[PDB]
Design a protein around this nucleic acid. Sequence first.
DNA 1: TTCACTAGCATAACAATGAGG
DNA 2: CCTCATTGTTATGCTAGTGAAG
Lengths: 77, 101
Amino acid sequence: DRVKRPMNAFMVWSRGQRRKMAQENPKMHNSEISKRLGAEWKLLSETEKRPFIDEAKRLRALHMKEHPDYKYRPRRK
Amino acid sequence: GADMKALQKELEQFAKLLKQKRITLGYTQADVGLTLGVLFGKVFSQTTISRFEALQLSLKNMSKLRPLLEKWVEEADNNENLQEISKSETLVQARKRKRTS
DNA sequence: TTCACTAGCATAACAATGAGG
DNA sequence: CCTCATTGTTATGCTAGTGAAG
């Protein structure tokens, strides 16, 4: 029941893609999956990244709408 | 500053209003820093913006940046209204072109 | 060659996801 | 529980640089 921090544009796009990639070839560890996902994202153009960036913006806005008193609180090492 | 109590109360509620507006407009803290630097000629790091939003800055610095942020939010809201009107206009234009095609 | 503050520069934490230590 | 692996947003620990007092 703890509030999690909102996900940026990458996390949105990666969450979409890694489910498809796991259904595509199972028995593949998310480490190589995330390496490949980041490598692919680095090659996208701004025209291609636009909708996910806008989705992350909408997500943060809706997060503040839901939790007006949220504060990200990490635990430093 | 008449007294630090009422002034700091007003300032700490203004900080929450500033965060709320920057979130509903889609700016990251680094984005606000970059835009402040570009329209006022003085760079502002994301660090100072986080500290402002956490009221972790000297009251003199809080009040020194408050007018800067007010001008910034005026310009940002103008830009947002402009983009919104332009998007709806282009949508009506696309309706016209598609129905008339 | 002392203490208090100031402002970045860096980098950790953490969001998702699940397999396998 | 935990570690991994990824990019992006946010909080903050460590500096170099600045005065002030003695």
